[PDB]
Design a protein around this nucleic acid. Sequence first.
RNA 1: UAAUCUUAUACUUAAUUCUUAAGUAAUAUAUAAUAUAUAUAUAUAUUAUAUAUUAUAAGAGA
RNA 2: UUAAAUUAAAUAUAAAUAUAUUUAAGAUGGGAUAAUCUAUAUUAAUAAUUUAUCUUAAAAUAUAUAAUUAUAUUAUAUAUUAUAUAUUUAUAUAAUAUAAACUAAUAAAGAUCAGGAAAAUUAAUGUAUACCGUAAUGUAGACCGACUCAGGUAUGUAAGUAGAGAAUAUGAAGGUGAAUUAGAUAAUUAAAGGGAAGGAACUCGGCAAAGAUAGCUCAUAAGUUAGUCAAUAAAGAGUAAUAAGAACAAAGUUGUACAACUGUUUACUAAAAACACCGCACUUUGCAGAAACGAUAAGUUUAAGUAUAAGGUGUGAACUCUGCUCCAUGCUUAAUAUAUAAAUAAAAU
RNA 3: UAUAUUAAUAAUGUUAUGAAUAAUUAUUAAUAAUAAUAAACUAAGUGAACUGAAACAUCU
Lengths: 295, 45
Amino acid sequence: LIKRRRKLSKEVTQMKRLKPVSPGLRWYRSPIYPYLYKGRPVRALTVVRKKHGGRNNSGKITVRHQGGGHRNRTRLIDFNRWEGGAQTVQRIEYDPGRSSHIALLKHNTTGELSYIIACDGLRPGDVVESFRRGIPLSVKTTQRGNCLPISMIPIGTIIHNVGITPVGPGKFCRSAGTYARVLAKLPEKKKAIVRLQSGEHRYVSLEAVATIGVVSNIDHQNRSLGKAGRSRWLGIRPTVRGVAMNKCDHPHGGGRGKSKSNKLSMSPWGQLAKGYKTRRGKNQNRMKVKDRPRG
Amino acid sequence: SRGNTYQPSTLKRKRTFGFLARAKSKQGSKILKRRKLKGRWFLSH
RNA sequence: UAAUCUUAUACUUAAUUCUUAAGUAAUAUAUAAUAUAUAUAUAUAUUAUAUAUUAUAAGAGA
RNA sequence: UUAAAUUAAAUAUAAAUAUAUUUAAGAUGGGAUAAUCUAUAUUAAUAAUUUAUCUUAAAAUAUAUAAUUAUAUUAUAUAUUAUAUAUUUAUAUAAUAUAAACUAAUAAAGAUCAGGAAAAUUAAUGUAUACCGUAAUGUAGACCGACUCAGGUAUGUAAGUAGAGAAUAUGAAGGUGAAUUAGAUAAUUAAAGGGAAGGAACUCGGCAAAGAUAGCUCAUAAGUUAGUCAAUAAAGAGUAAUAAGAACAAAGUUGUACAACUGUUUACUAAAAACACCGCACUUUGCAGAAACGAUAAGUUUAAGUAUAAGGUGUGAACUCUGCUCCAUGCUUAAUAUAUAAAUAAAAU
RNA sequence: UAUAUUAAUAAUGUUAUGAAUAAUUAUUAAUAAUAAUAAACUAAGUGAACUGAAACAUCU
Ligand SMILES: [Mg+2]
Ligand SMILES: [Mg+2]
Ligand SMILES: [Mg+2]
Ligand SMILES: [Mg+2]
Ligand SMILES: [Mg+2]
Ligand SMILES: [Mg+2]
Ligand SMILES: [Mg+2]
Ligand SMILES: [Mg+2]
Ligand SMILES: [Mg+2]
Ligand SMILES: [Mg+2]
Ligand SMILES: [Mg+2]
Ligand SMILES: [Mg+2]
Ligand SMILES: [Mg+2]
Ligand SMILES: [Mg+2]
Ligand SMILES: [Mg+2]
Ligand code: NA
């Protein structure tokens, strides 16, 4: 079994590219995941994702660049895990509404189904558990796939989903390939110190859930969309540069020929785009302990 | 080639400019009252 | 921290339902007495008196 | 999606109102059964993004000596005949019966861009079938264009012959031959056809107009990011054709500048070297976020997302690469240096 | 669905056992019904700008 595991670890995810018969196919690059299920999700666990186009309830675009991608079904995925008891992972699926893969768990006592975010090496046929509801010697608990309060995880262990409050769901490190690490634990204050994917070291409540391991689809980073069309399919409308506009529209607008107009890089609404911290003064993350690396 | 800007469809026109549409909203009510005060024969589509 | 803020989720009487008042049962908390166990202190049981029937949990917090 | 509509106190707001939440409205979609014609009422009980259907296998037909070769057939859609079971009406079986297209239904299955929402069964008792649309016009004299306007306007069928096709030719049937005619055809204009000898001498510039030696099957270099990308390569061949002899598809090679490329753009003078892009880089934001909107608020988008995400900024695929410089304007960290604004006792002239 | 529903009765047809259950008609009683409404004048909330100042910002 150990040998098999080792072999699996060794095996790298290939990067599929078609023959460059069109100039757009030249730079399309996607990771292959062959163990990743083929078919559909469970209709009882999906709801329609209703497209907004980046328009607010005013009808006005509030967030630019959002637009008409493919039709999409949202999968209700469990970021909570309040169930407890073993669960066999039936299959690992593609989720269009997030970068990570998702795993379909069947709970063994009941036969009831749920989706989780898939951990890195998780595979169909594996078994995981949840320990929100206490334990009912120790190392059997801590293994990639299962969730538990941070109070139960050994210091130094890499984890992915991280809650903020005890009663609350996993908010942090849910994207493809991401992960956090438990740095310290303070029982007296009821806080643990977690370093998040950015590198910030932050206080999190002790009873806050986390699931062990790294988020799956680590190779997602390297995928190269090959053509404009692909972005469009993903609901990403084109971004127009300030410099290509007129002063009425953007601070960078105007000028005969291309020119930054000796104006500090800034947004269309005038706030600075390089370096300027936007959360500042009184409002600020109290639980910040050690700051992120750059700014 | 411009000129043909009005592209009749009865549904759209009744729904947008119709009497019921006017009477349903406060602004619409104002308009109807205005037209009554002028003595217009036709208060809206 | 009962400052501020955040998030989640029984009967009787009197003017078919509603409301009041009395007591009694039920649960909780506070105070007092008695019995037992352990190291003047902690735990359990019984009795007396008082109070309650927007809440609970989580978080930030002068 | 919409709704002076709906929770002492739903929340917020100079008023108007706005917001989340319920309720109702809202087709462009979904909605039992049915020529062997069909009954929707009342009461009682407990679906589908796109796309393909190959290869194999099976059996059939011919050559040759069970096995090989070659060919077509292979999931469904009726009628006729002959059989066995309930009793001419039913059930199942066997045999017989073209082509290339199309339709619907069936099953199986490949791609990443991962593919709507919403209203149960049986039994008993029932049914007299409401309302409205229905002409004609609808690639137009009957709509939108001020006109009986060469413009704009959604869907299905669209006889054969021919062919890869809804190409192109004809046109069976149907429809139509018109609010201008009749003559004449000068100069001249428009839209065509032909042209000796020259072949770009024209002109800003081969603009315009010529120019196609198979549309099937072969054969196709350099260069290259290795993609018959270049390529529908040019040239060239096979079948057809020996100077008389349809229409339509198909019009060269090379160098340089600019931009990678397919795209988008000034509706009505500019389609480009401009925007976009895939990629590259910088940056803000830990979610009780950042960004945007919000007389401003609640609150919405961001997102049922969580730093491999999201917002902003520059550059704009890839290959070889990205030197030196924080003076200045910003941002950003560190302090000490250091001024000042409002806001206080009680007490002095 | 006020040629409404409920109750009460009365004549009527059916079923199961003089009494019980459902159906229709007829009288009596009970139970809700319909924001078409002025205009100017008055008070209050918010409150421009053009303009004038021979420019304009205090002011208007
Ligand atoms: Mg410009
Ligand atoms: Mg220049
Ligand atoms: Mg007009
Ligand atoms: Mg509107
Ligand atoms: Mg409805
Ligand atoms: Mg016309
Ligand atoms: Mg000349
Ligand atoms: Mg010349
Ligand atoms: Mg041509
Ligand atoms: Mg270009
Ligand atoms: Mg043009
Ligand atoms: Mg580049
Ligand atoms: Mg980014
Ligand atoms: Mg540029
Ligand atoms: Mg006033
Ligand atoms: Na500029």
